Each structure stands twice: as structure tokens, then as C-alpha cells.
């Protein structure tokens, strides 16, 4: 569960 | 860049520090209680005992109100257990570390706890969760691991100071004995204490597969915003994360409020198809995701950037006129629509309005939505589109539109501190470039808003009279009146003048040539003005402080200052200072701004003045250092948030200035080819425009840049100077394409480095007298957007025209130097070199 919610903060940029 | 908010002391025309306590005593012994240089932290120190070279540290997270108790509770289960800790010293500190726009890696960290070692660690975890079990769950620390279900977090990292040359923070490893410190939005364990980490991992005890989630748009301490795609559709949508007790604003409201206020007031405004509509809302995990109706297009700012015409294209501003017509007309009723729900849009500006490929307008983002007629102080104020004399909610919404009306016609930011003066400037500009037609449209729409404000509160504005402000095109007239301006605004503090915020934010900024007193001191000395004021300041401030400026930088540090000192007759002092520079450091920074090139340029100019070969020898040694540094990697690391690694200030173009200059004094052809090459490598990162005929540079961040800092004007200065030393006429075709920037209509800001002031340099490079006049006259049009009549004289707006500044970087000194360049036909006159009035003649072929 919180493996996604926190893994989102990790996600893509430019 | 958001730092400018911090410097808006009310009732000042200048950038000035906004001044604003977590109490506690029953303080035991060798509990030394101190602050810092001027940080957020308050250290509670015990005894005297080596706390490890790094270790496992505990952070307690808290929320704003609880905070006062959370400290008293943890401080005692730390005082009685005689443990060492620090906490954020006051309310202002807590706000800044937890605010909407705090860095993610550092937020939530309210109290830090340093246990002697791993047993008392894996036991303070225990004895602290317990004392704070009955306290509201505060902001989650993203850099740390959470302990069980508590406000207690832990991470491995440094307990004091560990730095890798210039390489951020660290922790001494074993073989490498350095390991930089991973402060990041995730939990990034070391490796050499991996052992103890896994131990803790087993003692620590489909609603988003609903959508695919590719890209992230923006982050921010409140949460994130993502590029989603709901299958069961393919309906691309925008998801708004909201971490509770996180991104605080100025009202004590967390990132929960501004999702259930972007709810209470997204609800009432479902009945308007300009406005945004929601998908759902839910408490997934501990967070929240209010899914938003996606809207293709661009924000107004992005539209302005790409579509507003900047090149003097001779007929076709009407194109943009109808567009400002299509858009603003709607928005005017779209705000009328909203107001029959009883709810205020809260924060109206070109960011929060969008525009498709057919000019459809919609208002996104509702964190600020309020009740019309209510005067609670608003959440986030967007300076440049607000004023602190509107008392009532509704009024503020319309004032935003008012200011925004003109903004789309002439996109130049201003604040309610300077708007008094510059309204004159922009209206006259608009009248001049659009016609009386468009001017009239604007005036009324702005009197319209005045109506819709009088509906809400007492608001009698002052009236017109454009004739009260006229352009000045006489260079000598402008110089003199800017000088008097500077003379009229001498602080009598250490700074000598009010400049950019970098005066307070950056090492040596109160003294150095770029934002400090040296820059105005220098300029006043060129116009043989305010001699005793300059002497007083040199004598009783500068000399005392000189040995304490850590940086050697030409703009940022000692070398610019040494130029002033030498030109003032203080040869001895420069002499002694150079004895110390020869060793000071051979750094990895080669920039003109702050690096070996800028320093080397100064050194050469001192060699020219003194004819003392020790300085030539020093220039050659500096070259050898630059060469090697150039070899270390074809990249440039950065410090100043406005810097970029192209152009004359922070780029290889500026490195070339040094090589040209060194050419002039050696007669060694090798340096000349390094100069040409360094230019060349910069020209490679230019973008010539096919439509309009203008060369600009292109940054990493995919900005197109004209300016002296980062842009093509700087590149040109480097070409002009290569040519000047060698006798050639290289890059004549790229040179011509840059001077075409003379035809620019407007810039967002006014300053030498980052604004309109850049363009002043264009004329000093034109060899013709005949095209110099047309060109000069164009850039003076640009400048007159920014020139402010005040009493008998002129003053100059700083960055974003929120406040005045007299400094070289943004203020009138930068401009005075540029205008004197034009006169002298010297595009390098803004450089702080020794006897720079002979420099050109001495470097000429």
C-alpha cells in the first residue's frame, strides 16, 4: 500500500 | 526565486528582511543552550562527549499547535535521560520548514535526537513513541523511515559537519571515508550499516492501479501532481496528492484544508463549465487524492512566453489584441458567474488560467477559495497581482483581474509598491504600441473591476494623467538622474546601498561588486560623484570587512572590491591582498562571476596598470588551472539559482574573455585559439529563429535566453572582445543575428544581468554610428518601461519590479555602467577591472 503512495514521490520529471 | 516574498518589509520601497518562540526551561547543568550563525535550530547540549562521526538519529514530527507540548514532553524524556537534541527555534522556523514550498527532504523534522549509540537508539524509539502517543499525527518525513505508527522517525546520517570539497553533505565511510549524505524525498540507507537496518525492518512490527500513473507534473511539500490515465476510459486526468499536516500556509492551514476547501468551494462551483470539476475524492492510504478534470492547453504564462510577440515585426500586434480580447472578455464574466455562488477565486493570475489551441479559458487550482464579503487574510498572496489595501475577499479577486488586464497587453511584473510609478510607464507603452483603441479597452475593463470592487468595499483610487511621465532618450540625462537617485538613497549601514536580496542571502553580498556597496561605490567614482560618502564607507566599513570576505570572485568576492580599492589609491592593501591570492585557492570554478576567469581577468587588468611581471606570472598560472579544470569535465556545476552554464557570466564565453585578455599581453597565439574554441562551444548551444531573425542561446531547461547572464548578448560581448584583441572579424554573421535582439519589445524584468538592462549593451558593440542610433533608440524604448521619475531624479526597480535597487546586478548602478558603455563604445564597462577606462586601449590589437 504505502509502497506505492511513497513510491509516487519518487516518480518522473523532466 | 520565491525568496523575494521574504524581503517585502511593508512600507519600504526596497527589499528588506521581514522580521517576525518555542519556550521551555527547568534547564539542568552543562545544558548549554545556543542558536547558530542564524539557522532554524536551537541546540540543547550536554557535558562534553564525542557524539559519533555520524550515526542513527531520531526525528520527532509534530503539528503546529501540539508542538508546544510535544517539545516539553520529548525534552523531558531527553533531559531526564540526559540526551542531546535540537529543535526549531520558533514559530517562523516551524512554518518555513513545513510550509507548502519547503524542501521535501527536510520537512517535518521538528526535533532531532542524538542517542549515544544503537541501544539507546532502538530504545528512544520506544521511550519517545510512548510519551507522545496522545498527540495528533504530524507531517511524515520523506527522507526517514517511520517507526511503527508514530510521529517518530529515524535515519542514518551526520551529527555535525561532513562535506566533500563542494559536494553537499557526507558521512565518513571506511575505504572511501566520505560517503555523501542522501537527503532526498525517499529513504536512502547507506550500505556499511545495512546490517543494522534490516534488523529494524523486522522489528518495525486496487485503488491506484485504478489509474496508470506515468509522468509527474510538479512536486511540492503539500504533495504531488501526476500525468494519469484512467482505464475504464483512457480519460487522461490530474491527481492532487495531499499529505496531512504537511505544506502549511500563512493561515495555519495544512494540505488537508486546501483539499476540503478545494472541495467545499469546488462543489458550489460545479455549475460553471469554465471552472474545473472534480472526479471523486477519498482518503486512500493516510494521504488523499482529489482527482481533477484534465484540461489540455497551456497556462497563460506559457502562452505569453511562446505566443506574445517580442520581435519588432512591423504590423501584427493586432493579432495579439483580439487574443487578449477573446480571453479577457470571457474571464470577466467567468468571474461574474463564480460570484453568484458566494465564493471567491482567491488567487487570480496567469498561472491559474489556461488557454487551448482555440483560446478556451478555465480557472484551475482552488486552494484559496473563500467566502465573498468575508475578510480573513488570504492564504497565498501572489505579489504582482494583489494589493495590501484590499480588505474584503471579493475585491481582491477582481483586483487580480485588473492588474492581469494590463499584464496580457504588456507582460512585465510589478508589485503594489512600485505600480504607483510604473502604471504610467506601461499604459503609455501600450498606447504607443497598440493604439488608443487597445489602451481604451484596458482603461475601462480596469474601471469595470473598480465597479465590482465598490460593490464590496470603500475603494476610491487616484486618477489618470499620463502626461506626468515622459520618456528620456538622452544618455547623459539618464545617467545623471540615476546617479542623483543613488546619492538620494544611501543607507548609512554596511551595505552602502539597497540592492537585490542576494545582499542578505549570499556570502559577501553586502560588500561585493554584484549586489554590495563596492558596486555603487565604483559607479559613483566613475561619475566623480559622492567622493566623501565613498571614502567614509570605504574607510569605516569596507577595509575592516575585506579580510573577512571568503570568496575571491570578481562579482561575488574580493577581486571586484580590489579593483575599487586600487582605483581609490589603496595600492598597499591590494598589494597585500594579492600576496594572499596567489595561494588563496585554485578552485574548480572558472566562471567570470565567481571563478578563476573573473579573477584572472582582474589580475591581467592589474598587470596592465602596474607593469609588474609578478601579475603576468600569476595570470599564466591561473590559465594552467583553468585548462585543467576545463579537462575535469565538460560540465558546469551551479550555485546561484538564476545562473546557467552558457554565456559570459557563468559560461565558457566568459572563460574566453580571460583568454583574449591574456592574448593581448602575451602575444601567444595559443590563447587566442582557446578563446575562439570556448566561444565556439557556446555558439553550439544557440537557437537561431527562422520566423524572426534572432539568435538566442538555449539552456538545458529549454529556455531561450537573450540576456547578459546566460544569453546571446553575452556571447556577442565575447566575440566583440576576441575581435578587439586580435584584429579579426570572426562570427560576424552570428554577431549580426544577435544585434537583431535590439528590436525586442519588452522583458519581464529591468536589470543589467536578467532584464531590459542587458540590451543596453547591444549598441556599445555596433561599429556603425548610423545603425547605432536606430538600435540605441530601440533599447531606450525597452528601458523606458522601467525608468521611474521620482522627485527630480530617476530610481530603478530591482528584480520583477517588486522593489527598488541601486546595485550592479539589478539596480541603477548596473544601468549607469551600461549607459556609460554606450557613450564610450565599451560593452565591457560593467566589469570591475583596474583602471578600466584605459583597459580597451591597452588590450587593442
Automatic annotation (TrEMBL), chain A:
Protein name per Swiss-Prot or TrEMBL: Class III lanthipeptide
Residues represented out of the complete protein: 1 to 13 of 45
Automatic annotation (TrEMBL), chain B:
Domain Protein kinase per the UniProt entry, residue ranges: 211-514
Entry keyword set: ATP-binding, Calcium, Metal-binding, Nucleotide-binding
The protein's name: Class III lanthionine synthetase LanKC
CDD domains assigned: LanC_SerThrkinase
PROSITE patterns associated with the record: PROTEIN_KINASE_DOM (PS50011)
Keyword rRNA-binding belongs to the record: no
Encoding gene (name): lanKC
Binding residue positions for ATP: 218, 292-293, 295, 301
SMART domains, sorted: LANC_like, S_TKc
Recorded GO MF terms: ATP binding; metal ion binding; protein kinase activity
Binding-site positions, Ca(2+): 365
Keyword Calcium appears in the UniProt entry: yes
Pfam families found in the cross-reference section: Pkinase (PF00069), RamC_N (PF25816)
Superkingdom per UniProt: Bacteria
PANTHER family in alphabetical order: OVARIAN-SPECIFIC SERINE/THREONINE-PROTEIN KINASE LOK-RELATED, SERINE_THREONINE-PROTEIN KINASE CHK2
One record GO biological process: peptide modification
